[PDB]
């Protein structure tokens, strides 16, 4: 099964960080550890080093040479490279989320209370097609710059 995981500012702006949220990074790690992660080449270059404890699959029509990750050229190849696993995590960026959304059955979202200047957005999804099965709000604190709300949604309908 395919899931997307993303952190969204107001207006669904995503980035590679205008905010400083170690709690969100802990949420990201907890929910991706021991699962393959699929990302586009822009996201890969922004991370710079393979995420530990996860198979790192990079979707790009023009692969790099880095032997530390697995390079694939299509959504279908990305999925095949993951093989028989319970859950595949798609970690962005904008275009990769857009291509994978139709195949996804679960969303892990962090809704951040920040207005920011970026131009890359998380895909449009029809809220009526999803059910909110978890939500938790957290205030900002000495370690986290903004307030945020974790949410998990499960797909109920497809169009």
Q: Which residues bind ligand THG (CB under 6 A)?
A: 5-7, 24-25, 27-29, 43, 47, 51-52, 91-92, 110
Q: Which of Mg ion, ligand THG, Cl ion, none lies near 123, with the C-beta cut-off 5 to 8 A by kind?
A: Mg ion
Q: How far apart are CA 112 and CA 45, in angstroms?
A: 24
Q: Which of Mg ion, Cl ion, ligand THG, none lies near 110, with the C-beta cut-off 5 to 8 A by kind?
A: ligand THG
Q: Which residues bind Cl ion (CB under 5 A)?
A: 27, 30, 40, 42-43, 93, 141-142
**53 is annotated as contributing to ligand binding:** no
3-state secondary structure 35-50: CCEEEEHHHHHHHCCC
Nearest approach, Cβ of 81 to ligand THG (angstroms)? 19
Query: 4: how many CB neighbours lie within 10 A of its CB?
Result: 25
SS3 content of the chain, % helix, strand, coil (to 5): 25, 30, 45
Site for Mg ion contains 87 (CB under 5 A): no
> Smallest Cα–Cα separation from 1: which of 49, 36, 53, 52?
36
Radius of gyration of the chain, Cα coordinates, nearest whole angstrom: 15
CB 17 within 8 A of CB 145: no
Q: Judged by CB, which is closer to Mg ion: 44, or 144?
A: 44
Nearest approach, Cβ of 156 to Cl ion (angstroms)? 25
- Report the binding-site residues for NADP(+): 7, 13-16, 42-43, 60-61, 73, 92-99
């Amino acid at each position: 099964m395919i899931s997307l995981i993303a952190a969204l500012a107001v207006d669904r702006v995503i980035g590679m960080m205008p905010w400083n949220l170690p709690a969100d990074l802990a949420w990201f790690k907890r929910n991706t550890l021991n699962k393959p992660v699929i990302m586009g080449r822009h996201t890969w270059e922004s991370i710079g080093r393979p995420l530990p404890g996860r198979k790192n699959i990079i979707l790009s029509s023009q692969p790099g040479t880095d032997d530390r990750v697995t390079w694939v050229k299509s959504v279908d190849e990305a999925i095949a490279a993951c093989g028989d696993v319970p859950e595949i995590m798609v970690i962005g960026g904008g275009r990769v989320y857009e291509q994978f959304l139709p195949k996804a059955q679960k969303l892990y979202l962090t809704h951040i209370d920040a207005e920011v200047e970026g131009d890359t957005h998380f895909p449009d999804y029809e809220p009526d097609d999803w059910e909110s099965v978890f939500s938790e709000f957290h205030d900002a604190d000495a370690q986290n710059s903004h307030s945020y709300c974790f949410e998990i949604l499960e797909r109920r309908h497809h169009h």
